[PDB]
C-alpha cells in the first residue's frame, strides 16, 4: 500500500543502520518513524539518548521528511517544540536525498552545532557570545532530559 521507494529505503536502513542511530517505522503507519540518536562524544550531549519523530509526506521524495526532537534539547538548531532548522530539510532538499541522509545530518549537527543556516533565535546567538555558558546549559539539559531513556 505504501510506495516502493519508501518500502525499499526502509529495508536498507533496518538492514544497514546508521551508527549511533536507531530508527524503525511506525508499527501503525510506515510514513512515521521512531528515531533514537545517541548524543555524540565530546559533544555537549555526550551520554544522552534523544528521541525524534520523522514523518514522510505524501509528496516524498519530492518534498522533504519532517523531523522533530521529542526529547528536550538545548541546541541552536532546534526550537522549544523540537523542530529542527536544517538546510537540507527546507530549500536545499532534493528527491535524491534519503532518510539516512537526514539522520546523518541531524547527528553531525549534534557533534558540532551550526549557529546559522538559519537558526532558532535564542540559543543560536547565546552559543555565539557565551559559548562556554551555552555548552554547560546543554550538558545540564542532557542530564536532565536525556539520561532516563524514556
Amino acid at each position: 500500500g505504501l510506495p516502493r521507494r519508501i518500502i525499499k529505503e526502509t529495508q536498507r536502513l533496518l538492514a544497514e543502520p546508521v551508527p549511533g542511530i536507531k530508527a524503525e517505522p511506525d508499527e501503525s503507519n510506515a510514513r512515521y518513524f521512531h528515531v533514537v540518536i545517541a548524543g555524540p562524544q565530546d559533544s555537549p550531549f555526550e551520554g544522552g539518548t534523544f528521541k525524534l519523530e520523522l514523518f514522510l509526506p505524501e509528496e516524498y521524495p519530492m518534498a522533504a521528511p519532517k523531523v522533530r526532537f521529542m526529547t528536550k534539547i538545548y541546541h541552536p538548531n532546534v526550537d522549544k517544540l523540537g523542530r529542527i532548522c536544517l538546510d537540507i530539510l527546507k530549500d536545499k532538499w532534493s528527491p535524491a536525498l534519503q532518510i539516512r541522509t537526514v539522520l546523518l545530518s541531524i547527528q553531525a549537527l549534534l557533534s558540532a552545532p551550526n549557529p546559522d543556516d538559519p537558526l532558532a533565535n535564542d540559543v543560536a546567538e547565546q552559543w555565539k557570545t557565551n559559548e562556554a555558558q551555552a555548552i554547560e546549559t546543554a550538558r545540564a539539559w542532557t542530564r536532565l532530559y536525556a539520561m532516563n531513556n524514556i
Binding site: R5, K8, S94, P95, A96
Partner: protein
Amino acid sequence: QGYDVEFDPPLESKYECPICLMALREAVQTPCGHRFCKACIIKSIRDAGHKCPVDNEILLENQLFPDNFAKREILSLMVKCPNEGCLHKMELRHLEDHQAHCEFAL
C-alpha cells in the same frame, strides 16, 4: 517508475536510480555524469528545479543523453517475475514477453 524487480545477482548500485531506487528505465545521463530513469529526471526537473538532484548543479531537460550502454546491459540482466508466487527467471529484456504467459497476473 524504474524496473521494480528482483535482480539476481542483485542490481549493481551504478544502475540504480537515485530518484526511484529501481533499475534505470530508459537510462539517461546528465552533463554532470549522473544517471536516472528518463522519466524520473524529467519529473524532478519539472517540479523540483532545473538542477541535478545529486548535486544541485544546473541541469535543464535538453541535456539528458541516452545512456545506451546502460540500457543495453540492464536489459541483459537476469531477473525474477515480479508477480509474486511465480518463480520464473529470465533476461530483463524478455520479462515483458513472459508476462503474456504468466500464471499469476491480470
